[PDB]
Amino acid sequence: SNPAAIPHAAEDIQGDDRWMSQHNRFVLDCKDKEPDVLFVGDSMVQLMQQYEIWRELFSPLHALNFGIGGDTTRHVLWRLKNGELENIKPKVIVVWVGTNNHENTAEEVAGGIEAIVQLINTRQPQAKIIVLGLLPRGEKPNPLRQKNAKVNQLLKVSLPKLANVQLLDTDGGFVHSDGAISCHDMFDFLHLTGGGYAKICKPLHELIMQLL
Amino acid sequence: ENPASKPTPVQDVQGDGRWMSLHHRFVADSKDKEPEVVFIGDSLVQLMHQCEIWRELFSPLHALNFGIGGDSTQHVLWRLENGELEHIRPKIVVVWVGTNNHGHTAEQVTGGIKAIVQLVNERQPQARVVVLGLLPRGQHPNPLREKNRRVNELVRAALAGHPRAHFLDADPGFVHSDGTISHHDMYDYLHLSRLGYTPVCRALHSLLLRL
Numbered sequence: 001s002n003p004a005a006i007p008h009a010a011e012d013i014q015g016d017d018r019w020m021s022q023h024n025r026f027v028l029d030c031k032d033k034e035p036d037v038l039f040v041g042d043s044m045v046q047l048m049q050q051y052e053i054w055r056e057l058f059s060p061l062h063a064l065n066f067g068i069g070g071d072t073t074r075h076v077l078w079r080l081k082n083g084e085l086e087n088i089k090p091k092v093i094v095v096w097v098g099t100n101n102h103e104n105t106a107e108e109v110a111g112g113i114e115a116i117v118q119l120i121n122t123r124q125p126q127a128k129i130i131v132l133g134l135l136p137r138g139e140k141p142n143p144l145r146q147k148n149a150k151v152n153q154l155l156k157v158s159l160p161k162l163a164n165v166q167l168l169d170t171d172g173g174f175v176h177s178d179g180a181i182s183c184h185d186m187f188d189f190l191h192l193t194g195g196g197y198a199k200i201c202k203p204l205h206e207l208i209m210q211l212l
Numbered sequence: 213e214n215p216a217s218k219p220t221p222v223q224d225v226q227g228d229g230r231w232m233s234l235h236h237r238f239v240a241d242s243k244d245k246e247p248e249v250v251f252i253g254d255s256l257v258q259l260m261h262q263c264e265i266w267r268e269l270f271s272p273l274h275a276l277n278f279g280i281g282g283d284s285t286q287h288v289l290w291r292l293e294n295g296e297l298e299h300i301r302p303k304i305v306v307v308w309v310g311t312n313n314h315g316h317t318a319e320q321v322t323g324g325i326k327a328i329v330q331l332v333n334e335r336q337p338q339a340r341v342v343v344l345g346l347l348p349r350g351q352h353p354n355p356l357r358e359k360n361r362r363v364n365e366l367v368r369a370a371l372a373g374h375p376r377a378h379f380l381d382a383d384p385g386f387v388h389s390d391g392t393i394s395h396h397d398m399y400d401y402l403h404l405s406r407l408g409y410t411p412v413c414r415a416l417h418s419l420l421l422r423l
């Protein structure tokens with residue numbers, strides 16, 4: 001039984017209950033909003049809205065962003081089953097999660113993303129889903145690059161399957177020949193800078209325009 | 213014994229060694245640069261440019277940003293004692309840490325901050341230190357708000373009268389009359405959005421010029 005495929009809320013261990021506050025807000029947005037494009041996932045998704053690129057490329061598409069920093073496949077699943085997929089009928093749904101699934105094997109993470117896709121076209125069978133490939137991370141070669149690459153390969157094979165879904169695995173010149181990632185693409189060797197998002201968003205935006 | 217003031221690095225528990233990679237970069241990019249202002253602290257410092265940017269109010273100052281998300285006081289202390297304060301001679305050092313010291317009391321965290329200031333005063337005596345107040349957090353009233361607020365009180369007191377250390381409470385009042393924080397100022401009720409940072413950087417800039 002895949003643990004990454006089982007919905008589970010991110011329990012508050014700090015005390016400021018920020019996770020639920022974000023979730024509730026997304027539920028609140030689902031009430032007085034009607035988007036055509038829905039963005040769901042982790043910090044890779046959330047942080048995208050904090051860059052100018054979002055207003056120029058995605059704001060015009062009437063898009064909602066339900067990204068939460070630190071979320072794993074389990075967390076995303078829970079949110080999707082608990083209201084974040086109600087009162088709305090998006091034509092396109094962008095999913096980007098898995099890089100925070102520490103302790104889970106690549107196979108488990110792939111399985112969890114699949115569980116997400118399955119839940120999405122169950123609740124939103126009319127929506128076309130776009131799953132973003134997990135990006136390399138770490139300044140130098142390390143286990144997570146391998147782990148993340150295996151997830152993308154596994155998804156590439158499992159996603160042509162399932163309904164209305166496809167894997168977009170765009171990759172800039174992130175990992176150079178010397179095996180290093182520049183802080184100019186990822187400032188902390190994980191999250192993207194504006195230059196880094198430029199390499200990913202443009203292709204993502206054309207596929208969305210297409211699907212729509 | 214105060215754990216908030218016991219120098220210690222962040223252990224890698226994911227496998228990509230990003231924390232050490234940042235530290236080493238901060239150590240290297242400094243032995244080739246001569247900044248006038250150096251920022252160090254947690255994510256609030258690291259992500260400072262996610263509003264307007266870092267040149268229309270900070271780059272002209274030839275500054276370096278050594279902020280790392282997730283750091284507590286003892287972490288910033290370790291980094292300052294292990295190379296980040298070498299090869300350079302800034303005029304001002306900006307400190308912004310404490311909100312992540314979960315498990316430590318306001319008094320312990322305050323001590324952590326005082327040790328950081330003291331460390332900067334010993335290694336970089338010519339610089340003036342600026343400590344930023346811990347910002348409120350959480351959508352609704354909660355223990356962490358009280359804790360952070362208490363830290364500012366204690367730090368303000370310990371820094372008032374300090375020859376070369378200044379406390380700046382750059383909070384414009386993110387907490388509204390109904391006790392809530394708007395996701396427009398803090399998208400996750402912790403990190404600042406682009407419009408949330410404005411008031412902070414604004415007040416920070418007004419002080420940097422005064423010094």
Ligand SMILES: [Ca+2]
Binds near residue numbers: 256281282312
């Ligand atoms: Ca942080």
